Symmetry: C2
Subunit: 336 residues, 2 copies
Amino acid sequence: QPVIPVRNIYYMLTYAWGYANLEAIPGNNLLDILGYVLNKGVLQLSRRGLELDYNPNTEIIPGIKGRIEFAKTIRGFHLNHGKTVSTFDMLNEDTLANRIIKSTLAILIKHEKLNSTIRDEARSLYRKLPGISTLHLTPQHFSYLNGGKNTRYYKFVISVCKFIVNNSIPGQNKGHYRFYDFERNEKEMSLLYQKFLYEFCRRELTSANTTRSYLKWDASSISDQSLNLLPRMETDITIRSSEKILIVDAKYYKSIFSREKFHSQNLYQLMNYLWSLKPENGENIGGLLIYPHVDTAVKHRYKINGFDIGLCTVNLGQEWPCIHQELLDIFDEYLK
Amino acid sequence: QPVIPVRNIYYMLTYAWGYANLEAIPGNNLLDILGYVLNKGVLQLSRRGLELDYNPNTEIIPGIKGRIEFAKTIRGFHLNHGKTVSTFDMLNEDTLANRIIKSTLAILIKHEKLNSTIRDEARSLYRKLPGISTLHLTPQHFSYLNGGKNTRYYKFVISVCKFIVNNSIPGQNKGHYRFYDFERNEKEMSLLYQKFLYEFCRRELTSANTTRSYLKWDASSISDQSLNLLPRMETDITIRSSEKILIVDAKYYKSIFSREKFHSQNLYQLMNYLWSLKPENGENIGGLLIYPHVDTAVKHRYKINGFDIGLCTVNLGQEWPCIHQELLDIFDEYLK
């Protein structure tokens, strides 16, 4: 049952979310890492100042505040008991974004398997935010916040809040929670990998242009021009440069972690992407298969059907900088 | 949770094993069907006669039987107490094949969810075979019987015995057994489908020649001529005729059972099979995608990359003969 050290995933999640010292914490497991980011992350915000959104308030008060609503006043006859219905803007920190932080912290404490200090420190924070009201979180709450009015820093911790709630399962007790075994499932780990690269390549490969490209089948059918039944095909990433184009397909498989047979079923998808894609520039066409391995990294090249294709691996579990060096080394070879 | 009626699977299993009235039995579930085949199957054999294999026996007896072993006799001095060690051929029904039947019947009775009459009738049979010795079955036992000396009829019931043991799980009680929910898993149901067609096509399509064909990548690599890392590619079936060749890839998916998005990831495999395959005859090249659907069957044709390709379905759950008619109708269209 071999897996990646948990700390390294957080780095990939960071690029996945598109935006610190982790050596200090002694808990290798993820929630210890993830909570310490948040627990420190909240405190980092408070230094600068949390978001305060003017919420208009229409209420019945004994006097003039802001703009009086003449209609609701006369209709309810509130003048007679010395009151008016007036609209004014109380400034609160009770916004959806901040409510989510507080509700997330409640979930974090309730998790049964967690560092005690992490749980101790967070309980302070929950008390330190009296005005904010607890909420029962759903993805629909996060859906409303896709507008992204908030600052760039807020979006990072909220992304963490999205990860925690979805990857939280009740355990021994009804109240308490237990963390999901994220590493074991390939699909979510794989979907992380594909998104990890797409945002990563934009950062480092300033030389090349990095875009996801939709592809269209060359087919025509007398039955339907739509071709809906045909598989929808959208590249994982395309990283185009003037001298050479390159398509990459990346996936996480358990079989490859064992140093035997090889799982390369994804390759079957790849040629059709090369085929359906036709470049106006006509500089070259290349493909790449990249997978995660634990122990070591090996690079091969192939000349299959007039295409220059590479199968390669990365030794996750080594260290983040050499991994960062290794990736830049990787794309340097093929992007030429 | 829609699935195929259980009776129809037995027909596909029959072609899968390569070799009766099922209307009589009222139990729709599989083990009721499968046991009644076996329970009647054993009785069908006994009418003709069960296999009797001459087992040589070397034992210590008070007299001459067959060939006396002079050495073991003198070394043990058995002459003095009026005995000899002699080799002779007692004729038993205690062979591995027949032992498997009896052991299988014990498992069949122990299954908690089963028709009572089926369980009642089988318990008779277990008593009716006194000479045979019970055994604890493993696939390795079936492995030794791959020689297939036995008659053609024996191989059918033994194939059933292979299916039952593998698809048997202990349930409520330690002694009793509970049947596997075979339908729910796609892979074994899918692997049935691929094998179902390969043997089926040999039967009906006497006109065409039906063979599984291994394919080799057109690639060359400076690194290795072996290309071991590349995916191993072996067709599900190839059904070649003089006028036209045709490759088929068939798989069982749950998404397609819902009448939306379509799961055709297998198609990605298909083009590379067409590409890597080069016909000396050069008559034509065609491909087929065939899937199981429950309600209805729809056939489409495509002209993708110079290839004539069909995506089609079969309405399993209708009836076996029309299904048999439908398949012959299917291949008739494309094989042209």
